[PDB]
Symmetry: D2
Subunit: 448 residues, 4 copies
Amino acid sequence: TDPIMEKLNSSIAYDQRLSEVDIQGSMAYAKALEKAGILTKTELEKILSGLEKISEEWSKGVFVVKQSDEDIHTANERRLKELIGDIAGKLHTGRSRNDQVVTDLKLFMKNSLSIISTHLLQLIKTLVERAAIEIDVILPGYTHLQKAQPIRWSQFLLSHAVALTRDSERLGEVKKRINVLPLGSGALAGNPLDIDREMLRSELEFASISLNSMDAISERDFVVEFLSFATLLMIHLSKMAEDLIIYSTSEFGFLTLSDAFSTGSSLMPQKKNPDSLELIRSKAGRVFGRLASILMVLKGLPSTYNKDLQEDKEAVFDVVDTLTAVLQVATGVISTLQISKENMEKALTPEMLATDLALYLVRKGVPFRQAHTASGKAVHLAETKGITINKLSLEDLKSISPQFSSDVSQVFNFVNSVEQYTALAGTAKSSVTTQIEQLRELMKKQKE
Amino acid sequence: STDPIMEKLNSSIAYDQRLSEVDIQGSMAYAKALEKAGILTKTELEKILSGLEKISEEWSKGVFVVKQSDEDIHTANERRLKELIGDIAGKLHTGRSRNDQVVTDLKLFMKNSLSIISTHLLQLIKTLVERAAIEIDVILPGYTHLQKAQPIRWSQFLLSHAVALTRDSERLGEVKKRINVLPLGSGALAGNPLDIDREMLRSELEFASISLNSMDAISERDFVVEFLSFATLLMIHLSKMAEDLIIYSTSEFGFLTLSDAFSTGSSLMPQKKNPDSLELIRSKAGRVFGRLASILMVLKGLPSTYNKDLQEDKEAVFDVVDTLTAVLQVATGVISTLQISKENMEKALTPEMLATDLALYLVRKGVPFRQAHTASGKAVHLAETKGITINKLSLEDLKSISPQFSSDVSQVFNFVNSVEQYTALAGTAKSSVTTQIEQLRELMKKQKE
Amino acid sequence: STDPIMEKLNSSIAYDQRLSEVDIQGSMAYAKALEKAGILTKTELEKILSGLEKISEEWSKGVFVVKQSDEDIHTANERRLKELIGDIAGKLHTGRSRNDQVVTDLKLFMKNSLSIISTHLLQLIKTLVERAAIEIDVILPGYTHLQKAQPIRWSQFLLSHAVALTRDSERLGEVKKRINVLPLGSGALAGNPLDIDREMLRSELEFASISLNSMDAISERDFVVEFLSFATLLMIHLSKMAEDLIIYSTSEFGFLTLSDAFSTGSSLMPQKKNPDSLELIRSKAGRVFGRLASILMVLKGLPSTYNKDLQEDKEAVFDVVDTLTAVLQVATGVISTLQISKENMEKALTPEMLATDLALYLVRKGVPFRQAHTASGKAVHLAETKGITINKLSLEDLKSISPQFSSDVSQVFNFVNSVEQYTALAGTAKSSVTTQIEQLRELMKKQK
Amino acid sequence: TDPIMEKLNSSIAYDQRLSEVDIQGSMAYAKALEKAGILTKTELEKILSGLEKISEEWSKGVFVVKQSDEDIHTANERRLKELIGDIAGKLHTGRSRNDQVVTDLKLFMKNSLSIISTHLLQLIKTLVERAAIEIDVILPGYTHLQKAQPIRWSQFLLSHAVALTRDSERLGEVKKRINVLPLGSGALAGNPLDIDREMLRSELEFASISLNSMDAISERDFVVEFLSFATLLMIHLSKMAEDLIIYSTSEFGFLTLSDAFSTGSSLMPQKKNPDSLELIRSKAGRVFGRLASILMVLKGLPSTYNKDLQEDKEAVFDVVDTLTAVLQVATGVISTLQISKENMEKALTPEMLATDLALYLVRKGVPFRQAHTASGKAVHLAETKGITINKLSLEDLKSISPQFSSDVSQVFNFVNSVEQYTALAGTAKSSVTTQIEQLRELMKKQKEQ
């Protein structure tokens, strides 16, 4: 056996975090083997005790890895043997590395996804809570990154909560396809000892059992799916990071992040670098890379098991750790950032109310195209007098369209600007309250 | 220096014309809501609708006519409306914007495309499951590392693909539910400014729910990414199935032959068939994956809310939808019409693949896994040294390796008995494959619904 | 009996018509070689060449007429020729195959196409370079983490993009060279069986050399992947520049404005332009990357030699060729016609950005950086205390911090002198910029 | 200072590989600081002495890192003080982490590219040499994975070597741009102390120096290009692996991998699983994944430096180690695999010569169309007569075309088949010989790195 190739087959270098699930998997199997008559009652006790002690060695961090261990499965098998003797060997009866590895990665993923879920909900929750509290703050809404119209700071925050909520929904969909036991699939044709797979499932807490052994052994859908979910999640987070990074520019002045999530220099204590957000944005590429790699690893592979499939572990681990860290960093950034109502408020400009001005007419029967030209004509005027549109006199307005009354003054108020969007999903106060209620409901659904 | 070339990039009319009917539908739904909102008088309405319907027909009969001024499908339809009805149709744009219209049209279009793709997907699944039911007695080699591992039923192989496809169908449904949400009424960014009744819009357009936030509804393209993720994984599945059949159809394996319609030949080598169909299907995985990749890269780093960049979704969605619709039917064809060679499949099974069963023989007699496995190795080695296959070792020779080998060991050297060992749920044993067929059928019912 | 969908799925006519010309030229070259090989007589060659030149025209004047039987452009032409000069046309295919004829057309098309792209890429670089010389005096903020870091010449900025784009040009050349290798004469996969004169084919089609291995030349698509990698990196550069320009054109930054030609707007908000151009360019980065990912996966895992999978190459090549041609030109237009605001740019220059140079003042005076930094720190510190900008601190005050401060420390508080510190090669000092402009001019001459 | 954050910026666990390059970057800068008049000659010798001592520590591998260390950089600085004192602090003078980090990576990549180049050339040499030795072996050439026509085993081996040769040419082109000095660009606007960048260049063995400070700090083209070269190379390797995997199947039986690059069961000692090839093939996805990530990280970023660029190290390290391991595994596989000349021979069939039969007529003046027709008629005749085309008698052939003469007997010989392809790059022996020598020349030009 070649030196370099052996080092490539060697997963022991990173697959150690699968120690516990590999042990849990073995315990269930040993139980099913005793029920099948492959093990005696006493043997089972010996095995379980052995497996339990091994579990402790890892949790305590005292487990010793022999250079002869190519993977975590070999390590535990070797240990279990030097712990209870020959009897240890009977444990691998009819089992295969092929269905052991998938059972292991799936258990690990079910647990990790459970952890990713809490952080994700915590982020969404954090976003929603500030949307509640800062519901009066208004700032410009952008399109093409050019000030378009006023919107509530909360409508902006909520848009990110809503996207994340979808991420959460997908996470759940992926979580249930992962919650299917693949153990007892053997090398590819199934388990040859009529092993009780139902006992296996309930013992390991899966929701159901894999339908086809060839599929169960060679499919990495659960890996691709998780990656697809993780990548779109990062897209959302990269979009939010981009918004904030920009808003935190001295130019915009909208906000600045706490010191914990930014860096700085004693030469310019008035500027803060949003490292936190830059890191989050960059992880999108990192996670996408993993998605792209596994997809290509799978394209073209014939049935059933192929060594190519070992690339899955490192991709999942890296993604699980990336999301776990980035999600929390995002929650903190959101809860501890400081907006500037002042600058955010001074950002609002009269010119932005021009569209609302055209709406004022539409509400008085004046047709669409006709109102537009009227509103556009009104700007041209104030424009030629060196004054904003909210300033031009009532008489000036009259000359362009008799439709303009004295109430037209109401149009030049930002609170009024946003209150226009009462229709479901709008930036109006009422709509924002509705949304806040809906997200909290959806979060309850995705749990109880 | 290219203002004209700039305009060309914004041009979409060359490919978005398949959106004509969804655009018209969205406009009729909005006009109505515009009347309830009083923006339009009842009469103003009836004339608008009648105008949108004349346009509906113009496309539904290829009689429409685009001018060298129609930037896109929208402009092309509103221009014809200003031409049919007149200066009145202008009151329709009141309230909503292109940012609002765009996603509404794409979601309506995708919803229909998905349902169609689902039918084709389900047909493929039914074809595999059906063929698995009929050829349940066929046995061939099960492979790992493209090497003969152990005997398996040909049906187990077919069902492994059907099972994977079933997950594809489940994802398709999840992606469709998120697409069946009304985005119309979000306006250009902050929502509709006329308190338009969105429920009515939902009802008219037949969406299942209404979008929650106007900013999200206008800037998000999750439904596009998700669709592409579903498509790419589905393609991965199909690429694998194509690869398997390509290999099995080689003269070397000789397990099966594609029908004339899904393959090509040559006058000089009539008995030779190239698996054109399978190669096309396999090559589409990359094509679909690329679309996934492009959209993902297009979305990454974009700030709120709407940005021109999002205009790249249409072309990727159209390509993948057509690709999927064609690929799926071709695969159904291929599986439905290919010819298998029972003789060659069975002939490929060898005694050497039964060494594992030999070891299991001892395990069932109580011998420890290790001892048994070691004994089978010795038997394999002995036969090898005598230059004979293990199914020919005499009983004496076997007992010289372990007395546990009784005269009944002969039963081990039977390929049917080999696959019949796998009765545990999901195995290749006949009872197990039968069970799989019932489970899938019952799944095709939840997916059909 | 072929399946109708299989049929349609195999039709490239819809898009491969643009290969009409190069297909004929390949056929012309091959015919001439068939005459020399004794497969055709001069009389037959003349009749064939004449029938081909006729088809050429039919495409030129857009007169050519395609029929539903035309699966691909190769069939459209071969059929047309048969109609024109009778079944003598059949001989033209002697020893030739779709396999080597299809990759011959693709390289020829790409060679021509790349030639046009080179021109446009060079015109963009030039536009950037010439602008850098003209506005070399302009000074504005330099960003790190999208936060003001220190004064930089505006030209230093334009040039960083020209420099990146020149690397793109260098790659474009390296790719062109490998594309400029004749594949015709490779036959179906084992080579040409008629001892055809490939050197003659090369000379006629004008390639620089001939392919080394028939199998490789028919199965590899390195030339496509490589072109796509070059295009993708180019788009990245362009996407970054786009990002910079979109942000600079924000009301908030106000550093510049785009002409109406490459922008979009509203009659309700005259004082506002949306950078549609720059946004298109950025979006195309993904689009082109998509093609790259596409072909890489199509090729991955494919066996030797020819496979129908390779048919996906054309659509990917055409898309990117057209995308780059359109985008590169638009970029040029955007870069040449945009108007900067020297006022807002210098305005952005604040004394807080000279805190760094204050320390450098001490290091030149001999003060160890560790100490000169903490020194400048006390300065900004005491500066805030007195509620004044560091440029207002008195010599007396500066001395209380470090005796090394003299009357000249006053110069450190000048933007021109701030920038003029970077005279080291590639720095932002005017002399460094001019050296750059000159250097870029030299590179542009050689790559021609 | 957040704990998760701090852990995200850490890189000491993986960037230690950059120890020696970092120190070399310090010695260089230190000397440049002495010329700028910041470090007295006495201080220069003081530092250079320490820096060497620390570098000397890593060398013997006795260096020690503390938990306080985050960057391989700070790990070296911290240790500089522990040996030299406060004077160490002057090394930072006018030097940013921005040009210091891009300098370490290029210096590292340049050295990695050299190692990688060597292995690549070793792989090419192994293929070309084996081809020269087994130049007489003939086997089926495949198209759509179906026997298409006789070819020389060496023609097959050479097609891969040729592709691999272009990879080696891409390596050189990439190394060229990597071999440029970025140091002295500072944090963004360049070096502020008029540092002598020509001295740094000479000292760091770079070929030239960066043209623009902003570009040199923010660009990661060099990372992209390298990844692009690696991915194209891995594609090539995945194609070769697919081939060998297929050729090593029992069904094909064309060759067997040595025990060193394959897995096997004691129960089936004949079964040979091509682990080595599968590993190589799977790394293609792993590498492309890296390319994909960095590309998405760079997309849409604004000038100049952004913390995003930090994701480059791990991508480069992964692919550098992967390419190094994979290339050597490839080399091993190709030189230690045993071919079955006999099975490659028995795979050549008479049916694969109908094409040659038509060509026989073409050389005697018969037009392509008619030639192809006579041959096919000969195929039908042998079919109806129950024999193979080579068994048809002269009379059988004459009755199809008078142009057939007793000399047609030579058409039914596989050596003569491949010998028809004498045209440049064809599979005729003389052509294969010409390739071997063209490739040796090419390996020479490149070897002269």
